[PDB]
Amino acid sequence: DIIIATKNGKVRGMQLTVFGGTVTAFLGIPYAQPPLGRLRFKKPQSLTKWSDIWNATKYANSCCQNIDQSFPGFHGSEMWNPNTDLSEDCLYLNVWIPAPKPKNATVLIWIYGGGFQTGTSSLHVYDGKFLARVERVIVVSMNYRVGALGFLALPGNPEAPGNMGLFDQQLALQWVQKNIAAFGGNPKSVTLFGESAGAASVSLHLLSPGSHSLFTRAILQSGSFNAPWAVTSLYEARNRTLNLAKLTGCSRENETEIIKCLRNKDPQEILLNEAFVVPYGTPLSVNFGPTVDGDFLTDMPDILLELGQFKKTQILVGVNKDEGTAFLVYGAPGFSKDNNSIITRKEFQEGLKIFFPGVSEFGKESILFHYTDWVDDQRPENYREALGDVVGDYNFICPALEFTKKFSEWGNNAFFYYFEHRSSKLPWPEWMGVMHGYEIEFVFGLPLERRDQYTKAEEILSRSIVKRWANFAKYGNPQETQNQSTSWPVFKSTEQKYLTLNTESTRIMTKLRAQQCRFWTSFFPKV
Numbered sequence: 163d164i165i166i167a168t169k170n171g172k173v174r175g176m177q178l179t180v181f182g183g184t185v186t187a188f189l190g191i192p193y194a195q196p197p198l199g200r201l202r203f204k205k206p207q208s209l210t211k212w213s214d215i216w217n218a219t220k221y222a223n224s225c226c227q228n229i230d231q232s233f234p235g236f237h238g239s240e241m242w243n244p245n246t247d248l249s250e251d252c253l254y255l256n257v258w259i260p261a262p263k264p265k266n267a268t269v270l271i272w273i274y275g276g277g278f279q280t281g282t283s284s285l286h287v288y289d290g291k292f293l294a295r296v297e298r299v300i301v302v303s304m305n306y307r308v309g310a311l312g313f314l315a316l317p318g319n320p321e322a323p324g325n326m327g328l329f330d331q332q333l334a335l336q337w338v339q340k341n342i343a344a345f346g347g348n349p350k351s352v353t354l355f356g357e358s359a360g361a362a363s364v365s366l367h368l369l370s371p372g373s374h375s376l377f378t379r380a381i382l383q384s385g386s387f388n389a390p391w392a393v394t395s396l397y398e399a400r401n402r403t404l405n406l407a408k409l410t411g412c413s414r415e416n417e418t419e420i421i422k423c424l425r426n427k428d429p430q431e432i433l434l435n436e437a438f439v440v441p442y443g444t445p446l447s448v449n450f451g452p453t454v455d456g457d458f459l460t461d462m463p464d465i466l467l468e469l470g471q472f473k474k475t476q477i478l479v480g481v482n483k484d485e486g487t488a489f490l491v492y493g494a495p496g497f498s499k500d501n502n503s504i505i506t507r508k509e510f511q512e513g514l515k516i517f518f519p520g521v522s523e524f525g526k527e528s529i530l531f532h533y534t535d536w537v538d539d540q541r542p543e544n545y546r547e548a549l550g551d552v553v554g555d556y557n558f559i560c561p562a563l564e565f566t567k568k569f570s571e572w573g574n575n576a577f578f579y580y581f582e583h584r585s586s587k588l589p590w591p592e593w594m595g596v597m598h599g600y601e602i603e604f605v606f607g608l609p610l611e612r613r614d615q616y617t618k619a620e621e622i623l624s625r626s627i628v629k630r631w632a633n634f635a636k637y638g639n640p641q642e643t644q645n646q647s648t649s650w651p652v653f654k655s656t657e658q659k660y661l662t663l664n665t666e667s668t669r670i671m672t673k674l675r676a677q678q679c680r681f682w683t684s685f686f687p688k689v
């Protein structure tokens with residue numbers, strides 16, 4: 163039996179057999195007062211404290227969220243849907259530790275993505291027992307409110323200040339600060355890691371004064387706060403708060419009245435209207451996201467970044483080779499997971515209308531002009547390939563590279579990867595390539611599990627990634643030093659070296675998507 167005593171009371175874990183060894187798991191530890199009733203839309207509150215033993219033996223409630231019903235029965239989508247009850251009472255976290263209990267272990271904390279609208283810590287691809295077994299790190303992960311319940315904003319008004327999900331994440335990091343020593347962890351060696359909205363959250367904690375001292379280093383997988391989807395302008399954030407009041411018959415005149423009303427709606431009514439607070443949605447819509455709230459975020463983050471106002475530490479940042487493909491099947495014309503999706507020029511342009519709602523006509527000719535200069539053959543898959551690249555370069559790859567450049571210029575070591583392995587088990591079709599989100603299972607070590615049907619080359623790839631992630635966290639340097647591996651060079655402005663992660667040869671290259679990001683980063687924001 164394994165009981166640990168925490169500042170707020172005792173908690174009982176659960177032993178797990180992993181690869182002939184053992185990990186202890188504490189699944190479902192509360193970290194804040196449940197945000198119900200009068201606390202809906204408010205910053206998370208401190209935990210009352212309990213006598214008697216809290217059992218942390220199963221995942222807890224996922225936070226309320228809309229579900230992907232686009233492909234019922236389909237593992238490719240359904241693997242991202244919550245696998246525990248939805249409930250507004252979802253502020254819990256998980257701790258996997260190695261056995262025997264470690265003495266002063268480096269801690270990894272995962273922050274999931276999901277567009278800030280969806281996600282949960284209990285997905286099978288975020289299961290931290292492989293890491294803890296194999297690398298003897300402690301892994302922590304938390305649920306944080308998403309959608310309007312998480313990011314609804316009415317600026318300056320503490321009934322609904324915005325950024326509540328980010329305060330959820332932040333209060334989980336405090337919990338780790340106060341508590342992880344008792345589990346054998348080193349509060350002085352904490353690395354945050356996250357993918358997509360989770361990565362963007364990691365980068366905002368790098369800008370938040372309140373987070374400065376709740377962690378050591380950071381890993382950003384396919385996301386960063388300067389991505390076009392990542393921060394809602396104060397303008398939009400109120401237009402949206404109002405369209406939601408309106409939509410739920412909660413329009414008022416006193417704004418604290420609007421919120422009192424919204425607190426009486428029942429969660430389904432809020433979720434149901436979220437998709438409509440925007441007149442034109444894209445498959446990449448983030449209707450309720452982070453804002454400049456004057457609290458968590460003190461200024462537009464583009465400015466903090468440019469002027470070097472952020473935590474000085476090392477970062478590991480990377481992207482997948484076909485970031486944009488996943489989204490094309492959620493609304494782009496002539497695209498389907500059940501066929502090769504050869505599209506025509508006319509469909510390409512309609513595609514751009516879907517992804518770039520408005521966006522002038524010249525805006526969209528300029529994208530087409532940059533991306534449809536065929537070299538050449540013809541090449542029926544030209545327009546299909548080009549639309550995915552447009553979507554991936556704009557939304558993920560260029561914002562990641564730009565973030566890494568800028569961050570690196572204030573003098574910190576920074577490492578950049580380019581993930582280009584397609585999982586042998588991937589359920590989406592071949593033309594979608596190395597999709598967004600499909601490096602996560604390599605990082606968490608799922609292919610280390612031989613019973614699971616991955617190739618040999620996959621097990622090895624994952625073994626090396628896990629090592630590089632762990633070395634980054636413990637040492638600030640993502641080398642794999644033993645098996646004559648390629649040395650991962652720091653990313654400097656000027657040379658802009660990066661490391662490729664694939665099953666055959668990993669290599670050092672320079673200047674990923676140089677022409678494309680010059681277009682995205684320098685020219686496009688003007689239009």
Ligand SMILES: *[C@@H]1O[C@H](CO[C@H]2O[C@@H](C)[C@@H](O)[C@@H](O)[C@@H]2O)[C@@H](O[C@@H]2O[C@H](CO)[C@@H](O)[C@H](O)[C@H]2NC(C)=O)[C@H](O)[C@H]1NC(C)=O
Pocket residue numbers: 398401405406408409438439440441
């Ligand atoms: C800011 O909000 C207004 C609000 O309009 C919205 O009403 C909501 C309840 C919601 O159902 C939503 O679908 C609806 O659009 C937006 O104004 C709208 O703009 C379009 C044309 O651009 C009109 O044809 C709509 O009918 C119009 N509605 C009203 C009542 O004016 C507005 O566009 C939006 N601004 C943005 C894009 O941020």
Ligand SMILES: *[C@@H]1O[C@H](CO[C@H]2O[C@@H](C)[C@@H](O)[C@@H](O)[C@@H]2O)[C@@H](O[C@@H]2O[C@H](CO)[C@@H](O)[C@H](O)[C@H]2NC(C)=O)[C@H](O)[C@H]1NC(C)=O
Pocket residue numbers: 494495496497498500501502503504
């Ligand atoms: C690949 O499929 C797309 C997607 O939509 C289709 O799914 C198919 C597998 C098919 O069974 C069909 O029932 C379904 O509509 C096809 O695009 C569609 O093309 C048809 C042609 O008449 C249009 O009318 C549809 O509007 C359009 N679908 C939408 C809503 O986007 C596509 O043609 C097909 N392409 C191939 C085989 O290369």
Ligand SMILES: *[C@@H]1O[C@H](CO[C@H]2O[C@@H](C)[C@@H](O)[C@@H](O)[C@@H]2O)[C@@H](O)[C@H](O)[C@H]1NC(C)=O
Pocket residue numbers: 265266348350351378635636637
């Ligand atoms: C546990 O180790 C503590 C310090 O180790 C960390 O130093 C940090 C600055 C950071 O770079 C981490 O990556 C290092 O691992 C030490 O001061 C504590 O007193 C130790 N406590 C124990 C052994 O219980």
Ligand SMILES: *[C@@H]1O[C@H](CO)[C@@H](O)[C@H](O)[C@H]1NC(C)=O
Pocket residue numbers: 217
């Ligand atoms: C916690 O679970 C254990 C299972 O062995 C049990 O001994 C204890 O009574 C539990 N407390 C409950 C059910 O709240």
Ligand SMILES: *[C@@H]1O[C@H](CO)[C@@H](O)[C@H](O)[C@H]1NC(C)=O
Pocket residue numbers: 416417418419
């Ligand atoms: C709006 O109503 C709230 C809630 O009772 C109240 O605190 C506030 O003073 C009101 N604002 C004004 C004066 O318009």
Ligand SMILES: *[C@@H]1O[C@H](CO)[C@@H](O)[C@H](O)[C@H]1NC(C)=O
Pocket residue numbers: 625626629642644645
């Ligand atoms: C080193 O390579 C060997 C195979 O020769 C393998 O058994 C081992 O797991 C590797 N270590 C790492 C950290 O990749």
Ligand SMILES: [Cl-]
Pocket residue numbers: none
């Ligand atoms: Cl034309």
Ligand SMILES: [Cl-]
Pocket residue numbers: 646647648667668
């Ligand atoms: Cl190698």
Ligand code: NA
Pocket residue numbers: 528685
């Ligand atoms: Na131009």
